[PDB]
Amino acid sequence: MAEKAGSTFSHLLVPILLLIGWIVGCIIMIYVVFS
């Protein structure tokens, strides 16, 4: 979309945080589900 790195990182930053949150939640759920 934007050749600018700053903007590029910001654009991907959004989806990066969302994806990370899902991963973290999964790990936790497993901990609780386990015991």
Curated annotation (Swiss-Prot):
Its placement in the membrane is given as: Single-pass membrane protein
Q: Where is it predominantly found?
A: membrane
Q: Which GO terms describe its molecular function?
A: enzyme activator activity
| Segments passing through the bilayer | 14-34
Q: Which UniProt keywords apply?
A: Membrane, Sarcoplasmic reticulum, Transmembrane, Transmembrane helix
Q: Does the keyword Membrane apply?
A: yes
The protein's location, in the record's own words, is: Sarcoplasmic reticulum membrane
Highest taxon, organism lineage: Eukaryota
- Endpoints of the signal sequence: none
Record GO cellular component, one term: sarcoplasmic reticulum membrane
Kindly list the biological process annotations in GO that this record carries.
Answer: positive regulation of calcium ion import; positive regulation of calcium ion import into sarcoplasmic reticulum; positive regulation of cardiac muscle cell contraction; regulation of ATPase-coupled calcium transmembrane transporter activity; regulation of slow-twitch skeletal muscle fiber contraction
Subunit structure and binding partners? Homooligomer. Can also form heterooligomers with other sarcoplasmic/endoplasmic reticulum calcium ATPase (SERCA) regulators ARLN, ERLN, PLN and SLN. Monomer. Interacts with ATP2A1/SERCA1; the interaction results in activation of ATP2A1. Interacts as a monomer with ATP2A2/SERCA2; the interaction results in activation of ATP2A2.
General function of this protein = Enhances the activity of ATP2A1/SERCA1 ATPase in sarcoplasmic reticulum by displacing ATP2A1/SERCA1 inhibitors, thereby acting as a key regulator of skeletal muscle activity. Also enhances the activity of the ATP2A2/SERCA2 ATPase. Does not directly stimulate SERCA pump activity. Binds preferentially to the phosphorylated E1 and E2 conformational forms of ATP2A2 which predominate at high Ca(2+) concentrations during the systolic phase of the cardiac cycle. Competes with ATP2A2 inhibitor phospholamban (PLN) for binding to ATP2A2 and displaces PLN.
Entry note about domains: The transmembrane domain is sufficient to compete with phospholamban (PLN) for binding to ATP2A2.
Q: What is this protein called?
A: Sarcoplasmic/endoplasmic reticulum calcium ATPase regulator DWORF
Species whose genome carries this gene: Homo sapiens (Human)
Q: Which gene encodes it?
A: STRIT1
